[PDB]
With several copies, the nearest count.
Chain A
Amino acid sequence: VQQITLGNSTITTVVCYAEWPEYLSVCRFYTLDSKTWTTGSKGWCWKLPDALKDMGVFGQNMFFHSLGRSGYTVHVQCNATKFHSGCLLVVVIPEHQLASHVSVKYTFTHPGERGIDLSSPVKDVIYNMNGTLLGNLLIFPHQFINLRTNNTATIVIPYINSVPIDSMTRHNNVSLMVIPIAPLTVPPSLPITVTIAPMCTEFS
């Protein structure tokens, strides 16, 4: 029901491209720093597997072996009461080539667990970091989080890449982005907890 248990960890609680992650150990829930959806937030972007580069055995085996191949189950939680409103857009962008704020430097294309706060590569949410309007980003696997309707969003990302295994430290397969379309109106801040659990994680 509401107690998805994965490994030694336990938490309390939309298949991407209808292709379940599958093989050609390290499957646990990593709970990142909770983001504060203020009234003036423009979005968040998490790179995978770069977002898990320092998180225990997953982040260690990411740096030890060069080639790896991992799937994910992404839980994004915006806990709220029945008075709060707003909707977050959780999209998964394969090979999210960023546009610079000349190529974009490595420290920002690979930001790690913190990701890039778009309210601080280019941070213009209207062009999807690439000159494409944000509205046409709905072709990717998404789900709206309407506190009126929902409070959780789950995105099952398979391994999407052109080689069966690749260096996880130089290339992000997918990137989780959470962009607030309707602003938070409340009777002035609201936390977002993102917990990333790698599934079907393969190595060399």
Chain B
Amino acid sequence: TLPGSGQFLTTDDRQSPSALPNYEPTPRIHIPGKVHNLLEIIQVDTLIPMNNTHTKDEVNSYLIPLNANRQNEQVFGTNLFIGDGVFKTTLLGEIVQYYTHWSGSLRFSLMYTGPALSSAKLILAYTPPGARGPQDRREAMLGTHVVWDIGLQSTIVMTIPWTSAGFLSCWYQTSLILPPQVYLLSFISACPDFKLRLMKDTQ
């Protein structure tokens, strides 16, 4: 017998004698919605509780408030820590916090729910890791951004570059023209290139 014989290594998956070798279990049928890979379900976009400034959790916590008669102010702003803060309870931070290293591309989306008469221009500037997040509309517009006209197109989808932490700000280019409080809906998902390794256990 070689060293380490008669030990029980919990990570050693071995075949074992069945205690009921004759019992034929009930046959397996095809139930719909099988998930083979967790990268199948992080592809689905889920709401971000971005308004953590609320003291209790409620559906309003999924709503980023936007206000009329605001130009050059900041709408929202977030870090990309996928284990604490605002992302810890989303589907991304709920599966990501089971592992240690998350190398993969993200798809970050927003949806405007205001009235059909309202319109606004928001700057979605993406600051990569290593720089300081913008604190005014000009540093953000001088960078990488998409000019999304909320009045025309109610939904924008932005592909965040491969990351393997960077900042994200929103600014009013023009004033919000109101009809004669509005809310923003933010969604997060993962691109199909999102790997996951060293599965851990939170305590």
Query: Could you list which residues of chain A lie within 8 angstroms of chain B, going by C-beta atoms?
Result: 16-19, 42, 65-67, 82-87, 125-127, 133-139, 144, 146-149, 158, 160-162, 164, 167, 179-183, 185, 187, 204
Q: Is the CB of A182 within 8 A of B47?
A: no
Name the residue of chain B whose CB is nearest to the CB of A182. Answer: B113
Q: Is the CB of B116 within 8 A of A147?
A: yes
The reply to whether the CB of B114 lies closer than 8 angstroms to some CB of chain A is yes
B49 interface neighbour in A127, A135, A164, Cβ under 8 Å: A135
Q: Is the CB of A148 within 8 A of B114?
A: yes
Q: Is the CB of A139 within 8 A of B113?
A: no
B46 interface neighbour in A136, A148, A164, Cβ under 8 Å: A136
A-B contact count (CB 8 A): 104
Given contacts A126-B57, A148-B115, 16 further A-B contacts (CB under 8 A): A19-B33, A66-B128, A85-B113, A87-B111, A126-B59, A126-B61, A134-B62, A135-B46, A135-B48, A135-B89, A136-B91, A146-B154, A167-B130, A181-B63, A182-B63, A183-B183
Name the residue of chain A whose CB is nearest to the CB of B94. Answer: A136
The reply to whether the CB of B3 lies closer than 8 angstroms to some CB of chain A is no
B61 surroundings in chain A (CB, below 8 A): 126
Given contacts A19-B32, A133-B57, A138-B46, contact A148 B112 (CB under 8 A): yes
**What is the minimal beta-carbon distance from B36 to any residue of chain A, in angstroms?**
13
The reply to whether the CB of B19 lies closer than 8 angstroms to some CB of chain A is no
Given contacts A65-B130, A82-B116, A87-B185, contact A158 B154 (CB under 8 A): no
Q: Is the CB of A85 within 8 A of B58?
A: no
A146 surroundings in chain B (CB, below 8 A): 111, 113, 154
A67 surroundings in chain B (CB, below 8 A): 130
B112 surroundings in chain A (CB, below 8 A): 148
Query: Could you list which residues of chain B lie within 8 angstroms of chain A, going by C-beta atoms?
Result: 29, 31-33, 41, 44-49, 57-59, 61-63, 89-91, 94, 111-117, 128-130, 154-155, 179-183, 185, 187
Q: Is the CB of A160 within 8 A of B45?
A: no
Q: Chain B at the A interface: mostly helix, strand, loop or mixed? A: loop
Q: Is the CB of B32 within 8 A of A135?
A: no
Q: Is the CB of A148 within 8 A of B154?
A: yes
**What is the minimal beta-carbon distance from B158 to any residue of chain A, in angstroms?**
18
Q: Is the CB of B115 within 8 A of A85?
A: yes
Name the residue of chain B whose CB is nearest to the CB of A164. Answer: B29
Q: Is the CB of B91 within 8 A of A66?
A: no
**What is the minimal beta-carbon distance from B14 to any residue of chain A, in angstroms?**
30
User: Which of A67, A164, A185 has the most CB atoms of chain B within a 10 A radius of its CB?
Assistant: A185
Q: Would you mind naming 10 contact pairs between A and B with Cβ atoms under 8 Å apart?
A: A126-B57, A126-B61, A133-B57, A135-B46, A138-B187, A144-B185, A147-B116, A148-B115, A179-B59, A182-B63
Considering the chains assembled together, what is the distance between the CA atoms of A117 and B201 in angstroms? Answer: 38
A204 surroundings in chain B (CB, below 8 A): 128
B113 surroundings in chain A (CB, below 8 A): 85-87, 146, 148, 181-182
**What is the minimal beta-carbon distance from A51 to any residue of chain B, in angstroms?**
21
Considering the chains assembled together, what is the distance between the CA atoms of A147 and B180 in angstroms? Answer: 18
**What is the minimal beta-carbon distance from B129 to any residue of chain A, in angstroms?**
6
B41 surroundings in chain A (CB, below 8 A): 139
Q: Is the CB of A66 within 8 A of B129?
A: yes
Considering the chains assembled together, what is the distance between the CA atoms of A204 and B179 in angstroms? Answer: 45
Considering the chains assembled together, what is the distance between the CA atoms of A19 and B61 in angstroms? Answer: 33
Considering the chains assembled together, what is the distance between the CA atoms of A204 and B129 in angstroms? Answer: 11
**What is the minimal beta-carbon distance from B134 to any residue of chain A, in angstroms?**
15
